[PDB]
Design a protein around this ligand. Sequence first.
Ligand SMILES: Nc1ncnc2c1ncn2[C@@H]1O[C@H](COP(=O)(O)OP(=O)(O)OP(=O)(O)O)[C@@H](O)[C@H]1O
Ligand SMILES: Nc1ncnc2c1ncn2[C@@H]1O[C@H](COP(=O)(O)OP(=O)(O)O)[C@@H](O)[C@H]1O
Ligand SMILES: Nc1ncnc2c1ncn2[C@@H]1O[C@H](COP(=O)(O)OP(=O)(O)O)[C@@H](O)[C@H]1O
Ligand SMILES: [Mg+2]
Ligand SMILES: [Mg+2]
Ligand SMILES: [Mg+2]
Lengths: 119, 471, 505, 306, 202, 43, 51
Amino acid sequence: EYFRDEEGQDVLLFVDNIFRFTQAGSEVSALLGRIPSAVGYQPTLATDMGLLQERITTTRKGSVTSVQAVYVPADDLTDPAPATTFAHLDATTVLSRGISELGIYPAVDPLDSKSRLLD
Amino acid sequence: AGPASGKIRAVIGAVVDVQFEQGELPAILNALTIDQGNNQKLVLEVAQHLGENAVRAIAMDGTEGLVRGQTVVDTGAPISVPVGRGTLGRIINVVGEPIDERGPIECKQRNPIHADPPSFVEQSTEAEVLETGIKVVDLLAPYARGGKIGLFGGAGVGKTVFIQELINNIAKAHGGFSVFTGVGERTREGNDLYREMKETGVINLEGESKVALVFGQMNEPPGARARVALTGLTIAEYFRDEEGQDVLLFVDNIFRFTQAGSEVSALLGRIPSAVGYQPTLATDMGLLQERITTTRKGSVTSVQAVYVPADDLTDPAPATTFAHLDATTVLSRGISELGIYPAVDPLDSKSRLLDVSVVGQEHYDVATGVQQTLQAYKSLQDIIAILGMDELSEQDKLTVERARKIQRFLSQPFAVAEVFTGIEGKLVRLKDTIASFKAVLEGKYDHLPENAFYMVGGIEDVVAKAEKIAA
Amino acid sequence: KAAPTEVSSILESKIRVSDEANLDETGRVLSVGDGIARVFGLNNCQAEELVEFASGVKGMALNLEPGQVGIVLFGSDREVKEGEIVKRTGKIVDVPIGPGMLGRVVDALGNPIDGKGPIEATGYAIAQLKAPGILPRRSVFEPMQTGLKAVDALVPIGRGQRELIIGDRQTGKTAVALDTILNQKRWNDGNDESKKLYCVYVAVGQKRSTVAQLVQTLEQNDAMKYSIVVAATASEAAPLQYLAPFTACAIAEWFRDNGKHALIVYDDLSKQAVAYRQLSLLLRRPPGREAYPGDVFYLHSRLLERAAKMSDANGGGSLTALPVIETQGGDVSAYIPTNVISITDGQIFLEAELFYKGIRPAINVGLSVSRVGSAAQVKAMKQVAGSLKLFLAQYREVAAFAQFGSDLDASTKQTLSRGERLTQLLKQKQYSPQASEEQVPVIYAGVNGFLDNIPIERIPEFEEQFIAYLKANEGDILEAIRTKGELSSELLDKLKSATETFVAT
Amino acid sequence: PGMLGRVVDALGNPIDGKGPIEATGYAIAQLKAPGILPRRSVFEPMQTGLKAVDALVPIGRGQRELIIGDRQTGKTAVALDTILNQKRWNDGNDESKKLYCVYVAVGQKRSTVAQLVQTLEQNDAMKYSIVVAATASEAAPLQYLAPFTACAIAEWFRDNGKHALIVYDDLSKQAVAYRQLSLLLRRPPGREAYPGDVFYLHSRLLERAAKMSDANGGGSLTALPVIETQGGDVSAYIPTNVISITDGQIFLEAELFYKGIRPAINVGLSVSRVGSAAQVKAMKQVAGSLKLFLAQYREVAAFAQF
Amino acid sequence: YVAVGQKRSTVAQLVQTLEQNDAMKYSIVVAATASEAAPLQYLAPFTACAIAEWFRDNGKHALIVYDDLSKQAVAYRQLSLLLRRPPGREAYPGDVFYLHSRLLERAAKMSDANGGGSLTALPVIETQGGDVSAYIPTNVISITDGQIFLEAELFYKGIRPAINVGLSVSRVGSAAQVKAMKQVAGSLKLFLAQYREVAAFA
Amino acid sequence: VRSSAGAVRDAGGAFGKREQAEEERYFRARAKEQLAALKKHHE
Amino acid sequence: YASEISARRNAMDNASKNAGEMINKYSILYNRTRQAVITNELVDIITGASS
Ligand SMILES: Nc1ncnc2c1ncn2[C@@H]1O[C@H](COP(=O)(O)OP(=O)(O)OP(=O)(O)O)[C@@H](O)[C@H]1O
Ligand SMILES: Nc1ncnc2c1ncn2[C@@H]1O[C@H](COP(=O)(O)OP(=O)(O)O)[C@@H](O)[C@H]1O
Ligand SMILES: Nc1ncnc2c1ncn2[C@@H]1O[C@H](COP(=O)(O)OP(=O)(O)O)[C@@H](O)[C@H]1O
Ligand SMILES: [Mg+2]
Ligand SMILES: [Mg+2]
Ligand SMILES: [Mg+2]
């Protein structure tokens, strides 16, 4: 964020993985005295994930893109760690295992990868 | 004498807090006597100490009638029980008293129920097989001599009938003495087990007995059910260490020991674990299972029975006991409804004596061939429910008929289950069960029907049933 | 971070002189609400003792602390306030018993609720009593005739055993226990005390209209004169419904310890578990599984272990327990469902699929079983229906083959036709119990193949015509099966010849 | 090096009855793991002995291979065969080819620890293998600290110039001992009745077994944790935390063990994160063509009935 | 428009599109991002209803859009879980159904003696995989007079918007409609639901 | 991938009841032919 | 025989397509039941430890 506000450049942040940030926040909250939420998650799930995702936006001097790797829990997109991070994701780079060895470099799915800026 | 007298300060359920003096407080796992209105006493085992000259004790009986400020004397040691040859034939309780109305147990010594287990240097490994008499137990999961045996099963599958049928053909002809310690049983099961042993020569009231009876079903409170396993194991451990005899501990059921401690764990100040269990589940189950092993002084073949909660092997009381048992006889509820007596799983049951170096090269090939044919029939049965029998070829048609006859041949009629089946009891040896299973897998009994092997013995009973059914 | 007991009000009395009045036999109510009542004092009060307040409501001190005493009120807490006097009776939670309690609808404490004045009690027994030992118990050899044809031949119950009744709502749970009490009128109206069995209905958790409708049907059929009714509705306190199982067992134990037979019906077992967890949660106690107490399995196992058959040296009596388990959608793998099925000697599964089609009662032969076996049944019913347990399993597998398109199997045509007629003949109507002489003739004609040539719709008319012809023509064959209770060589030849000639009008 | 040949407990005391142990140092149990600058690539190959483990999921020195599976399906069978197969390199003179085993029996009974130690001594395999005895009959502090005490003794060989191989048997028993002591110390619980540091307790002990570079000594340490699953569910609470922190997992199903596969090792579920970089060049030529033929035959295995 | 639970970049882009089409001059915008506290997002529904109630009590119509209703339920449960309360279904307190029913009951139509105004409520429920039988899904459908189900299957095929005729209905929508559109669309709701079931089996 | 070794008969629904009835009907028809051929070969 | 084999291929494709839709609906119900079982079991241990 310092390169976009002081120097003015479109920086790209990578958080590998995105599922590790949500699980680390509930560990320190449960050991302090806070009660759990659904699926053993922390009560401030929407407040902890929104404080770090709102800072990587576009300002008057520059922008800050985010390319985190979201991991679904046990192949479930309706969980508390998958549905909370998908509300702030504008694009998606799904890399299925159908290509790879088929002859595509890289394995980019043209039908599974969707984005909200394709209008 | 300077007795440690205590005052009752709190009483909620089985937990009773006793307040004594400074310095004269009793230790943990100590029996505390209490004078009531009858001729008996109120035994109370000290669990933990809350502090301020007070310790929380767990009563082993009814807590009704205790007022605030009653006298609570301390015995100084733990729960003493009668050991030796005097306990054979009598019905002992959790505190070591007789409940058979046959006078007092004339014992010269009294050992405590709380004791440490054996060390790693005192352990003696073995690889001997024990013949039980069943066709499904002598071919699949063989029982080890001197090890822990677990009969896993649900409610109504056949857990109580499996321990009663094995004691009438192994414990009655063994050189050592038996130790039937029932924990968490029923009221009708205790009276039926004592009358059957007297008519067969296991418990003689006027002669000699070789079976220790330890009462303690679900009719008492939570303190007596949790201490029933420690009181029954103390009498069997003295016969294998001081006397040097192959004792046989029969626990029924083994799942009641873990469920009894979780009932009083909420009132003792402990947080609950998973599925409403206690946090010390792996510590309390390992302290009692390690003491019933085989050392250098003698062996101890424990034949306990585990009760699965509503047919679930992934529970915290069933999965924690599978690592401390050599032979596991898991039972399924689906095989009991089809007519298999008993419902012995040929694929879920495993044992450490099912190798080629213990049972031989001939017995190892028969066990692997029977398990491969039963496992392959499950995959072929799913295709017949959607496509039919037209998709099966010559090899698939012969494998389906051989798998049905092999499952009914391992189910033999027990001697204790003669009132529900109607036929007589049959007992097959270890050599006759291996010879009959190898001949059916080669193609020597392919022309016989499936009804000739159901509820039969060995190879001799299968040939006589086919000729009588065709006439 | 602090502690209770001495706080503000209770902390200003120990600094001067806290004496004068005695605090051992009586006590002051410091806090009360939601049934619980924290009484400050009562040093001489024992555990589970009957407490009497100043307003007239009874109490039971179950939680004794060091500064207070948690007592559970047996009624309404609207008249109990802070600072009320709570006297101690000096005894425990007892109830009335004796032979004079038959014919009046008592409550959970022994008080009469039917309006017949006082109860002629001959003794005073405690509610929390010890069960029988292994030396004072014998084998279940007596036969409990319930009246149903599908219960007396399959899972037969005896005097001293505990038979559960699992099932959903409106499936046949309460109807199975009511039919067994009315079927004992043939032995209780005579003079044989060894064959009579007194009923003991303990309606716990039911409504007000359900308890009044069941007592009115038994009085019109000459069955309420020897039956104890324990009224325990859900509109009372939590301590009255939870103690309904212990109070009803003490009254029925007086007849088994003298030389008579008793039959207790705990309807239902699911309502007793919810009442015990409500009083324990309000007394500041930790919960267990499914928001219940720690000793949930020990509360139901201790009350059912006392109903056992005594030996010959104890009097020769027995006590039958009929606990109904209310399931939710046929789920038997719950917490309160699996705990009661592993303590009783058998269970009667009542499915909701066969109850709506018309097969009343819906008793599954492949799920319900009896742990007593053939020893708890009569010799007459076991001879004519020896293969009744094996015919139900073979007919179930052959019935599913008709919906696949197979029309062959000439040898299986006799077994498939006999299985459909045997299930309709064993299904009886409500309040229509049969004796041992009428059920032995109906089971012999359906198992030997004599009912295979009749129609399926005429199965109801064939049962009434066969029983009427055997009472006016060959009356000697019906009286021999009830007095002797068995059938030898002469009885088997006379019963087979009369059934074959009666099929042709 | 004096602890090789004797069975020690959780605190370092010898329980085999062979006298004292000549200890050359004292290391703490809660030690820090290696950094990102003192670690190198996995180039050495770990000879396990199995034909289906040396060709498919080949493990290397410094990686963490999980041994998932159900009850009695090949959990401890793969770890016992890999330690006994190192007799061809430990009996020679090459110190870089040898690998000292470190079996840490945690949660097992007293009879299971005595049977495993007697089988290794008869085949000349107990002279260079550490045994950490930790039965379930002791307290909750001794069983929970069995993973940290066994990792500290095996780290002395990797920091000098030798190789080590730890076998935490089992990973499911270590998680139950840590949650029992935290529940009695007045602490808040979390998911599946566990503490807040459930994922950090297993990741800290598994990250210390890495492969060092040439500037640190050239040693490595292998971690073979066995995850005892319930009924084949690999996506549980303690099963998903050990598979995400390790660089590979070997699945073991109960259905393939009764058919004829010895041992039951699913090729479609087990994979290694190192690939062919930590294997021999002679075995890599035959494993390349066998991987494509095994994957195509598994998807077309349903046509075998017709 | 009451944007509760949305991101910071989504609230700024939606306000710029309405001002370019002459639609932001008579519309209230209640910004309530997820980066603030848990008390600001939970009180966004009650604060937006008080500003729109002034026009209905004087003689004007108002239209409130609570986007979204699923985001407001997660913010209220965070403050209740930290105050040591009892969690019921889906880790929610006992007053979860009373918070959404009290804020939606005020958006009603007044009579002629109160001014003649009305207030329309448009709550958006974010379902998790089409689960309409959830704890927060059944509480909003039992207090509102109709719903508009948006299936994700027809939205990816080109049918925008994916409005299911067999699931979405209106209670007071028949008498509160235009007479010209209802006469030309004779049996339009019944013919649309029967055509979807016949086309799926052919 | 997922375990399905005998999942049809372990469920107990419509597919589980039809699999047990089909195997019992085929075994009952084959038992009649084997019993009749064994009695004629012994005399 | 050719018409019966062609009709059997269309019935097998329709049965495989109908099984995929039922497996997708059962996976959504199993995912919601797995998350509700973890929340209900954790609420029972937190209620007993706080009383
Ligand atoms: N490849 C194999 N071939 C033959 N037998 C095997 C093989 N793998 C394992 N076994 C048998 O399985 C038994 C148990 O093996 P192992 O010790 O690996 O599992 P376990 O630790 O007993 O499992 P659990 O802890 O669930 O009881 C051994 O007695 C062994 O004989
Ligand atoms: N060999 C057998 N043949 C027929 N029935 C049996 C056999 N073994 C057990 N059973 C039946 O299994 C039932 C077991 O009942 P019970 O002991 O109450 O439950 P559990 O076995 O789960 O403890 C008995 O009623 C008995 O009829
Ligand atoms: N043999 C029978 N014939 C006809 N109806 C019956 C029979 N047995 C029971 N029923 C019906 O079943 C209903 C049971 O009602 P109820 O006792 O309230 O529920 P439950 O039986 O589940 O306790 C009764 O209304 C009665 O009409
Ligand atoms: Mg039993
Ligand atoms: Mg009823
Ligand atoms: Mg192992």
